[PDB]
Design an enzyme around this catalytic site. Structure first.
Site, short mmCIF file in Angstrom:
data_model
loop_
_atom_site.label_atom_id
_atom_site.label_comp_id
_atom_site.label_asym_id
_atom_site.label_seq_id
_atom_site.Cartn_x
_atom_site.Cartn_y
_atom_site.Cartn_z
CD1 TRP A 225 38.10 33.28 30.26
CD2 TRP A 225 39.32 31.63 31.17
NE1 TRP A 225 39.19 33.85 30.88
CE2 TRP A 225 39.95 32.86 31.44
CE3 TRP A 225 39.91 30.45 31.64
CZ2 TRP A 225 41.14 32.95 32.16
CZ3 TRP A 225 41.09 30.54 32.36
CH2 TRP A 225 41.70 31.78 32.61
CE1 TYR A 229 46.26 32.13 31.40
CE2 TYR A 229 45.96 30.00 32.48
CZ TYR A 229 46.63 31.21 32.37
OH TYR A 229 47.67 31.51 33.23
CG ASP A 245 39.86 37.22 31.61
OD1 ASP A 245 39.85 36.11 32.18
OD2 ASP A 245 40.50 38.21 32.04
#
EC number: 3.2.2.21
Length: 288
Positions: A225, A229, A245
């Site tokens: 993650w 991002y 997510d």
DNA sequence: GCATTCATGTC
DNA sequence: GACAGAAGCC
């Protein structure tokens, strides 16, 4: 809010473009003393190599352009400042090419763009600090950090520059923890700040994105993650999707972190723009 | 205070 | 792909 410089610049953009939302988004994460966001106003400290100054960006919806003002110290590197603003604001985007490729997903909020950054490291620090905490909590934290390791401006005392890879890498992990983060996080920062000085962190969107994210996840504090991002905001990678997510799974009631990776295959190569729409488009329900 | 998301790290 | 530290509710 007087002009901060005598030189002004003009950046054209391709309509449509939801400025309300863009600056909205950027204001919620605005780091106090580093940057200030308002109605149709965005200003922030800025370093470009050795040069230091202030940049402000004001959209002009009608003439579809973006007005740029620069402190006198940024003049010699104006071209590169304008490229940061471009990358921060996603100015070179072709909304029609994207929105056509998104289909129904794009129909509601075609003005959405990819909020980028002015600096790949700064983004890296952010992605980490804002890891498990609310959007707002992450901004206060980052304020305190910059407050500590940020360099003030000789010509604009109100503003300070985001802390460099230098004074950040060489920081007491305990001083950082005392600002309101776990120790293992004060170390991710330091490991990042380090990767920066030894060219180990790509300061620009590398050739193989997927490959360069593998390399990232091997960092401490950085997983699938946090590394996705980052590629999105840090390299402005436009073909990235986080099927893991928390918010996305909720949008796919009854589907695995692998049954959507192949669903979002249908949005290549604009998966980052697909992801955003999904977040900020409320009444969107996937095609079952 | 035990519980639960949430994300990283390991097998 | 499947389990094993940090930041809400009875």
């Amino acid at each position: 809010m007087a002009d901060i410089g005598s030189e002004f610049y003009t950046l054209n953009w391709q309509p449509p473009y939801d400025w309300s939302w863009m600056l909205g988004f950027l204001a919620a994460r605005a780091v106090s003393s580093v940057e200030t966001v308002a109605d149709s106003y965005y200003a922030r400290s800025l370093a470009v190599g050795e040069y230091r100054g202030v940049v402000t960006a004001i959209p002009d919806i009608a003439r579809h352009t973006l007005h740029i003002n620069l402190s006198a110290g940024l003049e010699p590197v104006a071209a590169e400042c304008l490229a940061k603003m471009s990358r921060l604001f996603d100015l070179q985007c072709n909304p029609q090419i994207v929105n056509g490729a998104l289909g129904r997903l794009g129909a509601a909020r075609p003005g959405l763009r990819l909020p980028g950054c002015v600096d790949a490291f700064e983004q890296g620090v952010r992605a980490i600090l804002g890891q498990l905490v609310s959007v707002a909590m992450a901004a206060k934290l980052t304020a305190r950090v910059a407050q500590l390791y940020g360099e003030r401006l000789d010509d604009f005392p109100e503003y300070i520059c985001f802390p460099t890879p230098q004074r950040l890498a060489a920081a007491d992990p305990q001083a950082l923890k005392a600002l309101g983060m776990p120790l293992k996080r004060a170390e991710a920062l330091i490991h990042l700040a380090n990767a920066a000085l030894e060219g180990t962190l790509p300061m620009t969107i590398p050739g193989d994105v997927e490959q360069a994210m593998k390399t990232l996840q091997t960092f401490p504090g950085i997983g699938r993650w946090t590394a996705n991002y980052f590629a999105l905001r840090g390299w402005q990678a436009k073909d990235v999707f986080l099927p893991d997510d928390c918010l996305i799974k909720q949008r796919f009631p009854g589907m695995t972190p692998a049954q959507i990776r192949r669903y979002a295959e249908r949005w290549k190569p604009w998966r980052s723009y697909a992801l955003l729409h999904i977040w900020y488009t409320e009444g969107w329900q996937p095609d079952e």
